Design a protein around this ligand. Structure first.
Ligand SMILES: O=C1NS(=O)(=O)c2ccccc21
Ligand SMILES: O=C1NS(=O)(=O)c2ccccc21
Ligand SMILES: [Hg+2]
Ligand SMILES: [Zn+2]
Length: 256
């Protein structure tokens, strides 16, 4: 049932998922003046050279580009992370207007969209067990702004036509996630959660400072996706973002 509508949106999620009012929920606002530079942070390492994409799926909430995570290929490590985290999927959250769409905010600024690259900690064997641990997941968050087009995003954009409605999927091999990254790997990091039900508090968040630019046209095609299933009345897939949540007893560290 959960969604982003008036009757099933983020303000309703606590009823089925009481952790929504928890101690380390995501996303959060990033107060750049309060974040502290942490010399203890080691160099971040994003190694997506051997990434193997498999499929793209419309799950009724976003679209997921899924990877083969059966062995050590696309992995995130270093920075605040202990050990190696394996890429399982990526997805976006975006708005109905360029003025909104991101989940994390920076000094209350909302970007047009936000990319989440999801990885699980290989010490726990698989995703499922990973989401039972306080350090089971690492998510690399990247902001999207509207300006020039992102060439590495365009294969994603052109397949969306084929997964318009909930439950549809298409083959999506040989997609290179390195084309979605910005030049800089400066980031903010804090302990947090999934931004969607079940909102599990297992995530080390790594939010890149430098946004990637995407074209109006590319994000506009995102907004053509549907929340509903085929043959059902059209509910455009937009504003699938959760607003910022109480920082509570947490500190945000800067790698720069
Ligand atoms: O996320 C959603 N799921 S839904 O199709 O019930 C819906 C309707 C309107 C706005 C958002 C949403
Ligand atoms: O939608 C979500 N945004 S997130 O990156 O926190 C995440 C992690 C795992 C599964 C789903 C999702
Ligand atoms: Hg957890
Ligand atoms: Zn997400």
């Amino acid at each position: 049932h959960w969604g982003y509508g008036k009757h099933n949106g983020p303000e309703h999620w606590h009823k089925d998922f009481p952790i929504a009012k928890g101690e380390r929920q995501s996303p959060v606002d990033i107060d750049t003046h309060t974040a502290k530079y942490d010399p203890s942070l080691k160099p971040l390492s994003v190694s997506y050279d051997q990434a193997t994409s498999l499929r793209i799926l419309n799950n009724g909430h976003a679209f997921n580009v899924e990877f083969d995570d059966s062995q050590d290929k696309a992995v995130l490590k270093g920075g605040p992370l202990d050990g190696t985290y394996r890429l399982i999927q990526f997805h976006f959250h975006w708005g109905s207007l360029d003025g909104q769409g991101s989940e994390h905010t920076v000094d209350k600024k909302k970007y047009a969209a936000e990319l989440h690259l999801v990885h699980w900690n290989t010490k726990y064997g698989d995703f499922g067990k990973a989401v039972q641990q306080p350090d089971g997941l690492a998510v690399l968050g990247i902001f999207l702004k509207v300006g020039s087009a992102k060439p590495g995003l365009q294969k994603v954009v052109d397949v969306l036509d084929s997964i318009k409605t909930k439950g549809k999927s298409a083959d999506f091999t040989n997609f290179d996630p390195r084309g979605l990254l910005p030049e800089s790997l400066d980031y903010w990091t804090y302990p947090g959660s999934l931004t969607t039900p079940p909102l599990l508090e297992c995530v080390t968040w790594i939010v890149l400072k430098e946004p990637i630019s995407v074209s109006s046209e590319q994000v506009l095609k995102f907004r053509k996706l549907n929340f509903n299933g085929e043959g059902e009345p059209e509910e455009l897939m937009v504003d699938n973002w959760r607003p910022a949540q109480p920082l509570k007893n947490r500190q945000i560290k800067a790698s720069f």
